[PDB]
Amino acid sequence: SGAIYVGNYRVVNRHLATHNDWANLVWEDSSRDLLVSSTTAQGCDTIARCDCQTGVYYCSSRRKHYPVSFSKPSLIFVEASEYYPARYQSHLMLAVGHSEPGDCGGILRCQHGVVGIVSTGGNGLVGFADVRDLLWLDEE
Numbered sequence: 272s273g274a275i276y277v278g279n280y281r282v283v284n285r286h287l288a289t290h291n292d293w294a295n296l297v298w299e300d301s302s303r304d305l306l307v308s309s310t311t312a313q314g315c316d317t318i319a320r321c322d323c324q325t326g327v328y329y330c331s332s333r334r335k336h337y338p339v340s341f342s343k344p345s346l347i348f349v350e351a352s353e354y355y356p357a358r359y360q361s362h363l364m365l366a367v368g369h370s371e372p373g374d375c376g377g378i379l380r381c382q383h384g385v386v387g388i389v390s391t392g393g394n395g396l397v398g399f400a401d402v403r404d405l406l407w408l409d410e411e
């Protein structure tokens with residue numbers, strides 16, 4: 272579980288979006304496992320605008336923050352799960368690290384802010400859905 276709160280926006284894993292997220296839908300992309308809903312409250316989070324390939328992510332299954340190196344956002348083959356068929360996921364960054372299902376929504380950050388959220392795991396890898404291209408999260 273987890274969300275990014277920036278301005279009047281909530282960023283969640285599309286596959287973990289609640290009924291209220293869909294009732295307040297701003298934008299979603301199945302290929303990215305992302306959904307953005309609108310919030311009454313002002314969010315704190317700054318979105319990184321950078322090409323950092325190092326950062327720290329929260330792993331809820333270990334209650335720990337891990338430093339990681341991660342690949343640039345890419346089209347990545349992701350095995351079938353409960354939520355999606357075996358498919359290519361866009362805007363995904365892979366690192367060596369621990370990720371179990373309930374780790375999704377864990378934040379990855381660099382010195383510049385939030386880079387993305389845990390979206391995938393297994394085989395000793397963690398996948399992060401990048402949000403750094405979503406410039407519109409910073410206005411309106």
Ligand SMILES: c1ccc(-c2ccncc2)cc1
Binds near residue numbers: 329336
């Ligand atoms: C690096 C540092 C803090 C965080 C964080 C901790 C707890 N809740 C949200 C973000 C994520 C990555």
Ligand SMILES: c1ccc(-c2ccncc2)cc1
Binds near residue numbers: 325327382
């Ligand atoms: C919190 C989380 C990551 C970082 C970091 C990530 C990438 N490059 C430099 C620092 C600093 C503070």
Ligand SMILES: [Zn+2]
Binds near residue numbers: 319321382384
């Ligand atoms: Zn950065």
